[PDB]
Amino acid sequence: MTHELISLPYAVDALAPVISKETVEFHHGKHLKTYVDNLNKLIIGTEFENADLNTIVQKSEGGIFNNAGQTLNHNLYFTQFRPGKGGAPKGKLGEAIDKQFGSFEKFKEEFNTAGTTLFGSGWVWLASDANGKLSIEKEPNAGNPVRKGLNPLLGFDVWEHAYYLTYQNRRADHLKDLWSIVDWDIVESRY
Amino acid sequence: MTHELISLPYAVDALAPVISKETVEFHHGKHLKTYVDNLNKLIIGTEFENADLNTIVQKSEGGIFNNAGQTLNHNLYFTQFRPGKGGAPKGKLGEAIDKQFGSFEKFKEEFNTAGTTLFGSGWVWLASDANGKLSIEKEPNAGNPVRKGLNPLLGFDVWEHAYYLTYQNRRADHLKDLWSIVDWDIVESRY
Ligand SMILES: [Fe+3]
Ligand SMILES: [Fe+3]
């Protein structure tokens, strides 16, 4: 399989100010292109040469995993956002968040805390298991819930390249602002 | 002891453009300040409340280590640079680098490669053992060579906050430029 650099479903300046034009250009246009390019090179000659992306994340190790994990993480990341929304989840997912976390507000707070306290580079993920149970997963570096057999629903990138141009060291502020661009219709569809 | 935010031995704009004025403001002024403030609070009521930095780095774990390791790494990082220096190491260190790596140019290429291939946040360190044997250590996140009983001689920060404002994703270009601000008199003094 020759993995592709996903096409963004909105203009590069669509998520500003929370994710600026410049950040999208570097984050999607350079960092992700690199992860995709590296993944495609490393898998040739291995058992993952013709495997789907999810299988690679589930089974690979080392460099292949680092690039496969990052490719999947970013594909989910850029596709879950849209300008002018945010707000709150509804349907089956909104009801499940209320039941398991207490309320949407409490969920956001625990999620913000998980992302703020993750030391170094990584991702904070809302994931669901086979019985529909929700959990907040802290994933160092290239981690993704698919490695644990879980379904990734919403992931915030806390690698510094995701927010440094606009927020510098203010990661908690960036995380608080991200809720404003989450497209819950797309997230609910993942659940 | 009360751990201090280290006083810089030069003007805040002295390392520009390799480490710009704005980068020193955030990197030293915010990031390091946070590591030091957290270290001082976290050690209250622990076996480390009255230990020197080296001992905390050699024996702590968890959050105390994360902040103590980052404080030591940054104190060494900021104090090893100076404008109008750079060039090649001389004396004992210079000759040890030639003997172990063949030449200073080859050593820099190997050090640059280690810094470039370190996935995620971390440090690349030139360290020595009790008999002067040199090694290039890749330390993830808050890691420091004192943790394995070595002497930290030269360390480059590859956490993205160290270079993102000026270089964005061009980590390799940043690492090659750092050689130009290294004060070998100071590094030789550590050997
Ligand atoms: Fe990223
Ligand atoms: Fe740093």
Curated annotation (Swiss-Prot), chains A, B:
Binds 1 Mn(2+) or Fe(3+) ion per subunit. The keyword Metal-binding applies. It comes from the Bacteria. Keywords: Iron, Manganese, Metal-binding, Oxidoreductase. GO terms for molecular function: metal ion binding; superoxide dismutase activity. Fe(3+) binds at H27, H74, D157, H161. Its EC number is 1.15.1.1. Changing G155T: Converts the metal-specific activity of the enzyme from a cambialistic type (showing the same activity with Fe and Mn) to an Fe-specific type. Inhibited by hydrogen peroxide. Its cofactor is Mn(2+); Fe(3+). It catalyses: 2 superoxide + 2 H(+) = H2O2 + O2. Belongs to the iron/manganese superoxide dismutase family. Homodimer. PANTHER family: SUPEROXIDE DISMUTASE, SUPEROXIDE DISMUTASE [FE] 2, CHLOROPLASTIC. This is Superoxide dismutase [Mn/Fe]. It comes from Porphyromonas gingivalis (strain ATCC BAA-308 / W83).
